[PDB]
């Protein structure tokens, strides 16, 4: 009516405004820099002990301890240098689909089909890990969660909303609305001033932690978005979706920069992460293996095969030493 | 070698044996996924259980003839069914509830849901236990109103049992994989133990078939 026309003309104006900034392209600018060699990586460790599909993992900030969550109702904290199990937390609900590890190292988090984000305290005087909080208030499954400052946490659910919580009081400090489909992942900015969310409406949004407002909206994908990750610079990000393609967007240019797709890949993408310098892009697929792309050339530089089922989680340490990949065959592998 | 890393390794091994024991104890459980459309007789099925805080998934434990059954109710999700269904890829069976007394074409919605679930790419090799609830109201309505309204191609009489069999076979022939999986059908009755005995028999049959596939036969 009188407002759909307004929305359509605003959208057309936005498209024209972001069309005038495309003087060049990242590909034709990077056309004259040396390509990276064939990236060949070795499996240093294999972490066994999970008895079901591993759905999430997260590295410690010291890049030695990592947390993994499986569908058998278990959290395991591994010391990756020696493959020792530091802690094994039994969860009340076996249906866990995400996990996070606090930047300080004192707490971990879980969530899933029970719509509750559970916060567990690792450093207790009693000598055992006990649940510290149960944040409830979402009306859909938790799909991701990221600790912010050891006392507040950002979560995303299948009720098409994200939230920022306060662990002491247990109540939603902020609620982020504006998506249309399920929100499947989020990524915090390095300075924790902004974050990005990718939803099943084939769109990504850039939220400001303060003021609870959506800065920019990015489109270009064809299907549901399953993964997202900020560039180390903090001025760009990458998204993986179900159309077997990755996209690199830039915040300042407010438009798509590059796409990473191949004719031999038809399966969707489950996870995405960057390298320490941002030159490499790691992506996990449903065809049972991971792909290492050149972030500036958009051509595969390596393949990480060795998993017998879909690769579901993927992470890179804070110093860039190793890459941990976990799949649905209940194994995690450290690559270097 | 190791100074007090040996104590860390010993703690890791104790954690390993506890994990293995928990896995063994959890592998002796029967897990069933309970599905339906719009509370169409789910309550009268769960009422045979004998053992707002959590609104995402509902657990149900019971025990029959020393066998422990776990039932999962996911009717309060309201999300995209394709985003979380693969979590239940390994359940022993899917208990699907259909209300026979149907009026705003709800039978078509039930048939659509059954068609989607049965031919799903994750639930290959997973059996389905169909529960046709509310047969007395079906008796009454078929006495008053024929079945032709819901299904225009009904070329039979208004007799209760032949129309019920028609509905049963018209549900059962939606199974595209007539050889990979089997469908067990039941008409829920007021008797308390009949439903549980039917579920026990179906689970026994599906366990026997799974062991046939695992133990090298077939």
């Amino acid at each position, epitope marked *: 009516d009188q407002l759909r026309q307004e929305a359509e003309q605003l959208k057309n104006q936005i498209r024209d405004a972001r069309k005038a900034c495309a003087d060049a392209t990242l590909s034709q600018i990077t056309n004259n820099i040396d390509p990276v060699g064939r990236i060949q990586m070795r499996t240093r460790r294999t972490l066994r002990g999970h008895l079901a599909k591993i759905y999430a993992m997260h590295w410690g900030t010291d890049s030695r301890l990592l947390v993994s969550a499986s569908q058998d109702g278990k959290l395991i904290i591994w010391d990756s240098y*020696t493959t020792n199990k530091v802690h094994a937390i039994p969860l009340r609900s076996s249906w866990v689909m995400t996990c996070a590890y606090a930047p300080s190292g004192n707490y971990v988090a879980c969530g899933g089909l029970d719509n509750i984000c559970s916060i567990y305290n690792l450093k207790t005087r009693e*000598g*055992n890990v006990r649940v510290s909080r149960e944040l409830a208030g979402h009306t859909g499954y938790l799909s991701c969660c990221r600790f912010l400052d050891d006392n507040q946490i950002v979560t995303s659910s299948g009720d098409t909303t994200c939230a920022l919580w306060d662990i002491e009081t247990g109540q939603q400090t902020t609620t982020f609305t504006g998506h249309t489909g399920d929100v499947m992942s989020l990524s915090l900015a390095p300075d924790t001033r902004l974050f990005v969310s990718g939803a099943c409406d084939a769109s990504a949004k850039l939220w400001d932690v303060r003021e609870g407002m959506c800065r920019q909206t990015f489109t270009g994908h064809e299907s549901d978005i399953n993964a997202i990750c900020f560039f180390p610079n903090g001025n760009a990000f990458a998204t993986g979706s179900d159309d077997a393609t990755c996209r690199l967007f830039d915040l300042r240019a407010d438009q798509e920069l590059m796409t990473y797709s191949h004719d031999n890949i038809i399966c969707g993408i489950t996870s995405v992460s960057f390298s320490k310098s941002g030159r490499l892009l790691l992506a996990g697929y449903d065809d049972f293996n991971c792909n290492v792309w050149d972030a500036l050339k958009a051509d595969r530089a390596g393949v990480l095969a060795g998993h017998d089922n879909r690769v579901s989680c993927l992470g890179v340490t804070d110093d860039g030493m190793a890459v941990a990949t976990g799949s649905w065959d209940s194994f995690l592998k450290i690559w270097n | 070698l190791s100074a007090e890393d040996k104590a*860390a390794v010993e703690r890791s091994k104790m954690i390993d044996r506890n994990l293995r024991e928990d896995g063994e104890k959890a592998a002796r459980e029967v897990k069933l996924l309970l599905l339906g459309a719009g509370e169409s007789g789910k309550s009268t099925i769960v009422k045979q259980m004998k053992i707002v805080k959590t609104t995402g998934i509902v657990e149900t434990h019971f025990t029959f003839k020393d066998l422990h059954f776990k039932m999962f109710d996911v009717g309060a999700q309201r999300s995209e069914r394709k985003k979380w269904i693969h979590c239940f890829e390994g359940v022993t069976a899917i208990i699907f509830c259909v209300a026979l007394s149907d009026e705003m074409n709800r039978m078509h919605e039930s048939m659509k849901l059954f068609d989607s679930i049965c031919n799903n790419k994750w639930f290959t090799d997973t059996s389905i236990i169909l529960f046709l609830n509310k047969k007395d109201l079906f008796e009454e309505k078929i006495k008053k109103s024929p079945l032709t309204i819901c299904y225009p191609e009904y070329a039979g009489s208004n007799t209760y049992e032949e129309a019920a069999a028609y509905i049963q076979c018209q549900f059962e022939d939606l199974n595209k994989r007539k050889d990979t999986k089997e469908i067990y059908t039941h008409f829920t009755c007021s008797t308390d133990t009949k439903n549980v005995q039917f579920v026990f028999d179906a689970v026994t049959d599906v366990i026997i078939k799974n062991n046939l596939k695992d133990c090298g036969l077939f």
Partner: single-chain antibody
Amino acid sequence: VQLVESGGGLVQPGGSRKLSCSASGFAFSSFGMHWVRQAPEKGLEWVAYISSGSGTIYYADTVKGRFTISRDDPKNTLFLQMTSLRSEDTAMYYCVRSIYYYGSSPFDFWGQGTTLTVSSSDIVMTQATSSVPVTPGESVSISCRSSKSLLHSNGNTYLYWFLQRPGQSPQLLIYRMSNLASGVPDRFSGSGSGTAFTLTISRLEAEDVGVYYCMQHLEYPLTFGAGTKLEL
């Protein structure tokens, strides 16, 4: 969390006793347990260790054969059954918990100790200084020295600093030569290299006096060395 000891008293030589240590307020099954001994007006001396799950058991050379450590986890109790009691076993016995994983702090909690009286170690660590006169406005340095390089091939130096106040049980100050234990004021600090280590107190108070001990956790005999006394 508390450890409570019982079973002390006067015993004739050659007899036998059983000391009990009841633990309340923590997961007793997850902690390894140590029995430590302090002779009257002498330094600490490790006696026995039992692992979690009763897997590994270690005894001191001077008490091996006539002592037996055990635990009963359902009742949360730790027993030391000692036999052939000599006149050198008169002391106070402390019960110490210690949990080992990556980044843990063993020896953090000590029991009160029970007194037992009897009527008529390839690494040696030396604390050369025996007493130091101080005022509650300065900084104090306590030096410890080892006969072996406590630094291990994995980058960890296994030195622990304990403090015993007059009339109390020792408490963990520093673990692995650099890390402050939980609930310890920031004024304490530790450093060193391989064979020579130092504890530093920036600004003392009235509660910083007592006897300081430096234990090793590299080879399992776990020698202690006579402490350094701070008074006035």
